[PDB]
Amino acid sequence: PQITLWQRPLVTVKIGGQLREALLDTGADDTVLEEINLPGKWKPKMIGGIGGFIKVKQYDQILIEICGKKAIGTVLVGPTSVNIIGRNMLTQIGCTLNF
Amino acid sequence: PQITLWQRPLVTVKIGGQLREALLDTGADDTVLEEINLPGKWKPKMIGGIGGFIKVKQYDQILIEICGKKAIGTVLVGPTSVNIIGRNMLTQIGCTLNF
Secondary structure (H helix, E strand, C coil): CECCCCCCCEEEEECCEEHHHHHEEECCCCCEEEECCCCCCCCCEEEEECCCEEEEEEEEEEEEEEEEEEEEEEEEECCCCCCEHHHHHHHHCCEEEEE | CEECCEEEEEEEEECEEEEEEEECCCCCCCCEEEECCCCCEEEEEEECCCCCCEEEEEEEEEEECCEEEEEEEEEEEEECCCCCCCCHHHHHHCCCECC
């Protein structure tokens, strides 16, 4: 689908068998989601932002279905007030910017 | 221009007589620029992101040129790690997401 930007580009995503609403974030390199119960192993990681940084648990090869499409990649789980879908996943569902 | 996300969505923007590169950011409601000399007065404001909040200067009705297109609106200048063109400006250049 095509989406304008007068509102936040929020989509429904299915991850870890759970549902969530997330933002299609073209400015985010990574995909970061609020605390969600994901199975398995992970590595502690640091990621910076506008306010600075947060430490997050890094899960690799996580399958997500964004708005009806499938993609596998790294998902960072840490203290973020919003669920963000980054370019690593946006490139997989064939998302592009147009203007 | 149709922009793919394999790389950060950078664009050349002209603001206040100066040239800068800025990240087209759908995950940003606002436009936030790093250290830059901007004429006039403003209204202090604090915005949040990942890692906490940052104090910025809020300038209104600022002409901005992203690629070949002009837009006028609020711009925030602060300690940001990257110049960001948020939805307040993106809508104005008809920027859209597609997948």
